[PDB]
Design a protein around this ligand. Structure first.
Ligand SMILES: *[PH](O)(O)OCC(C)(C)[C@@H](O)C(=O)NCCC(=O)NCCS[C@@H](O)CC(=O)/C=C(O)/C=C(O)/C=C(\O)CC(C)=O
Lengths: 72, 349, 417
């Protein structure tokens, strides 16, 4: 679910869960880099139990973008 | 050339989590199988950000908290300092095993998926140097040494040389180590005790310790202009090597020249090897020296790169004011297994 | 001083001996011949893909089960032997107290430290067994194995050190070595860097980070192609480079052959990121200025640049913008190159291998090409000497370095007369 993802990004980026908007751009809003994106992608592989290519997680610009991915 | 002074110091140890608490316990102990002592009541969330800490190792953490104390002690307004004129010197031998250990093991059982993106950044010894440059924004020449035992001693020495030649006005020099992780823990508990030096001989019985220690070295005129409280002046540095026992005695006689025939001096010794007292005294006797010997190593333990630096921060504290009183020069020495001979000289004003 | 005045004034530093171990060649003769022609030293490898599931297919190797080969220390002793023979010193010339060592490294014996961990834990399945930890394992955790061993062999009683600044460690070793000679501390100085990171712990750390090249290729030598659109990262390599630095005064007395002068050195922190490099290239541009000011040479004389050129997209833009910042419109006229197109990226060793190459380039008045140059990049639009090398009158040369912790390092090299 998104509640599961929203908690991860809240802890990873050190943001308040209530303040963190899902549709906010990760790079622009929260100063997120490609290294944090790779670390985040690892946690998605760990928890949900799926495979994520570099080409796949590269397009995760938004919090809702990773939610759309993990669903499928 | 230019003159270098110590304006601030800061350190953390199993004895205490600040310079005053460590110095108090050192005096108390001085007045009246190997293990790895850890920090008591330490919490790194008290200092470092949560987003940053999850990226870095404990050795980088210990270094960051050490400089914060040292900068605070020096009373530097960081916003007023030119970042182009400030550099960072670091000593570190073992790196950051705690952060990458489980991922190294996982890479064999799982595959690539076991490993994360921070293995390269966390483990290497120059990580502390970079994290400090991101936090404070310091842009001048910044080096990291990883020479066995002497890394932190070289870090201070060559930081002073950089200030002297006019590379920077201020320097954050020091060292940090983390020895608690399973790999380095079981290694030091077994192997490190029984090892012997070809040059210096057998090791004395003793424990190991982890933590960090840092100084704020700066140019003398820069300190006097801003009205800084100078602890002591860094008057000299020695960096030599002994390939064999013949050179060993001749090398120690160069450490003797660092005294400048000063009778009112205290000599802090390495305290790792048994034969140090005999060989150093024999070399010092040839050069007409009369000085007191102090061994902090049984109290402060073997901290590798930190062991040289932790003496310097304490030496700086005494000169700014049991046995250290009525002394205007504290010389410190540090050896290695392979045969390094290194020494620093701090003098009072 | 009326009678025979000689001063304690800044002395000049010169390169009298070279030693190299690299994929492109072992020794000076083999190493030069291959880079002159532009032959790649990148090997196609298999165990990375099969065993650990790496996307990497290329490595720069000099010559599946884990083995403690101890290549870090081997390449240092190999290269140090070549350099000292090339220098052709004799006991008379070598004063022990004036002879120092400075061999740098980024990861040291990581291959040794990783073999130890997995052996005692039985393939990383269980907890550590204290009994399985041998006495030999402790020596793998020594970062300065190369420095101390080389020092002991040749009787270097002056400053022995190991700088661990990652990818800029090679130049920083040459930098501190240069300072020792200039300021009357040393006459001779053995300087360089050794690296052996072709092990799963190291390749994975970079593969996980995204630093390494991962695009699918048939011609795997083209994985490392600096200043091209196709580039996606560095091809990891191993090796060692060693330079025998000594004073001009000492060199001329003994009748030593001189390759080139090591004129200046500078280093900075960009304070930007730990692995990311900024497009602006301000810090690198500033570092170039300081190295030239340290050398006391004008930027007008800069005739050739040996760039870091890792083949990561970020670094090749950083360096291109940095050279344009400091040199201006003159940057387009100046030839640039990257050895990593052939030799691969050997971390700290890359700086010392390229320094050995730079000394040979200056001596023979020839510049090696940047091979595998496919499609021009809009952002990287300087002259990179694509594919074919040529004769060129090198006057003043810059060697650029970059690394993790945002460290930039430069040296100014110069022909001797
Ligand atoms: P996002 O997707 O934009 O990704 C970031 C990036 C990685 C692509 C970007 O940061 C980038 O492209 N950076 C370029 C880096 C570069 O070109 N620099 C040159 C090579 S760096 C050199 O300093 C290597 C180095 O310093 C390596 C170490 O210290 C190595 C280690 O720590 C390796 C280990 O520890 C492995 C081990 C034994 O544990």
């Amino acid at each position: 679910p998104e509640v599961k993802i929203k908690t991860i990004l809240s802890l990873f980026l050190n943001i308040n869960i209530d303040d963190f908007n899902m549709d906010a751009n990760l790079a622009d809003a929260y100063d997120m880099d490609s290294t944090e994106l790779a670390d985040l992608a690892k946690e998605i592989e760990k928890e949900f139990g799926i495979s994520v290519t570099k080409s796949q997680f590269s397009h995760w610009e938004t919090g809702r973008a990773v939610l759309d991915f993990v669903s499928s | 050339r230019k003159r270098v002074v110590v304006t601030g110091v800061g350190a953390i140890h199993p004895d205490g989590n600040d310079v005053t608490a460590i110095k108090s316990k050192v005096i108390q102990k001085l007045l009246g199988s190997s293990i790895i002592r850890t920090l008591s009541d330490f919490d790194g969330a008290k200092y470092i950000n949560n987003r940053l800490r999850r990226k870095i190792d404990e050795f980088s953490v210990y270094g960051i908290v050490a400089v914060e104390m040292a900068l605070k002690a020096s009373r530097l307004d960081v916003d007023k300092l030119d970042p182009n004129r400030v550099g960072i010197y670091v000593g570190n031998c073992f790196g950051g095993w705690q952060h990458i250990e489980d991922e190294v093991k996982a890479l064999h059982i799982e595959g690539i998926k076991g490993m994360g993106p921070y293995v390269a950044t966390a483990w290497f010894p120059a990580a502390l140097q970079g994290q400090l440059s991101l936090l404070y924004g310091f842009s001048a020449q910044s080096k990291t040494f990883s020479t066995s035992d002497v890394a932190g001693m070289q870090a201070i020495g060559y930081a002073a040389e950089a200030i002297s030649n006019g590379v920077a006005e201020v320097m954050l020099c020091g060292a940090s180590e983390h020895l608690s992780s399973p790999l380095v823990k079981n290694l030091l508990e077994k192997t490190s005790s029984q090892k012997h030096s070809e040059v210096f001989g057998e090791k004395q019985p003793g424990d190991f310790s982890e933590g960090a220690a840092f100084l704020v070295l700066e140019e003398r005129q820069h300190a006097l202009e801003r009205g800084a409280s100078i602890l002591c002046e860094l008057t000299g540095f020695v960096d030599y090597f002994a390939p064999d026992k013949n050179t060993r005695n001749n090398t120690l006689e160069y450490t003797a020249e660092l005294f400048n025939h000063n009778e009112n001096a205290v000599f802090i010794m390495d305290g790792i090897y048994d034969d140090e007292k005999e060989i150093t005294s024999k070399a010092f006797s040839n050069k007409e020296i009369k000085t007191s010997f102090i061994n902090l190593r049984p109290y402060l333990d073997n901290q590798f790169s930190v062991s040289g630096v932790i003496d310097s921060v304490l030496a700086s504290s005494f000169l700014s004011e049991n046995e250290f009183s009525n002394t205007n020069q504290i010389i410190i020495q540090r050896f290695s297994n392979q045969g390094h001979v290194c020494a620093l000289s701090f003098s009072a004003i | 001083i009326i009678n025979n005045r000689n001063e304690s004034q800044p002395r000049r530093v010169v390169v009298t001996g070279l030693g190299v171990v690299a994929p492109t060649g072992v020794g000076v003769n083999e190493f030069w011949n291959n880079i002159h022609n532009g032959k790649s030293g990148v090997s196609k490898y298999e165990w990375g893909r099969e065993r650990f599931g790496f996307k990497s297919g290329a490595i720069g190797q000099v010559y599946f089960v884990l083995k403690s080969e101890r290549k870090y220390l081997q390449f240092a002793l190999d290269a140090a032997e070549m350099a000292m023979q090339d220098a052709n010193l004799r006991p008379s010339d070598i004063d022990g107290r004036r002879f120092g060592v400075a061999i740098a490294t980024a990861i040291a014996d990581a291959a040794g430290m990783e073999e130890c961990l997995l052996r005692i834990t039985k393939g990383g399945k269980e907890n550590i067994h204290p009994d399985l930890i041998k006495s030999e394992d402790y020596d793998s955790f020594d970062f300065s194995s190369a420095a101390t061993s080389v020092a002991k062999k040749y009787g270097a009683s002056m400053s022995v050190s190991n700088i661990s600044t990652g990818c800029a460690a090679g130049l920083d070793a040459l930098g501190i070595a240069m300072e020792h000679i200039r300021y009357g501390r040393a006459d001779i100085m053995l300087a360089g860097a050794s690296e052996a990171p072709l092990c799963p712990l190291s390749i994975g750390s970079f593969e996980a980070l995204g630093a390494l090249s991962s695009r699918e290729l048939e011609n795997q030598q083209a994985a490392t192609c600096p200043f091209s659109l196709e580039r996606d990262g560095f091809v990891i390599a191993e090796g060692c480079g060693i330079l025998i630095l000594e004073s001009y005064e000492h060199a001329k007395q003994r009748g030593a052959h001189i390759y080139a002068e090591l004129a200046g050195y500078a280093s900075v922190n960009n304070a930007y990121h730990m692995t990311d490099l900024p497009a602006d290239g301000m810090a690198m541009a500033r570092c170039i200025d300081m190295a030239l000011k340290d050398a006391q040479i004008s930027p007008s004389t800069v005739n050739y640049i040996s760039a870091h050129g890792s083949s990561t997209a970020q670094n090749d833009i950083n360096e291109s913008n940095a050279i344009k910042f400091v040199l201006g419109e003159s940057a387009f006229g100046i030839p640039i190159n990257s050895l990593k197109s052939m030799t691969g990226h050997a971390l700290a060793a890359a700086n010392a291998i390229e320094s050995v190459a730079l000394c040979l380039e200056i001596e023979k008045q020839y510049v090696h090409p940047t091979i595998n140059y496919q499609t021009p990049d809009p952002d990287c639009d300087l002259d990179y000497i694509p594919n074919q090398g040529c004769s060129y009158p090198i006057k003043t040369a810059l060697k650029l370095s970059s690394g993790f912790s945002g460290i930039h390092s430069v040296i100014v090299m110069r022909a001797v007369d």
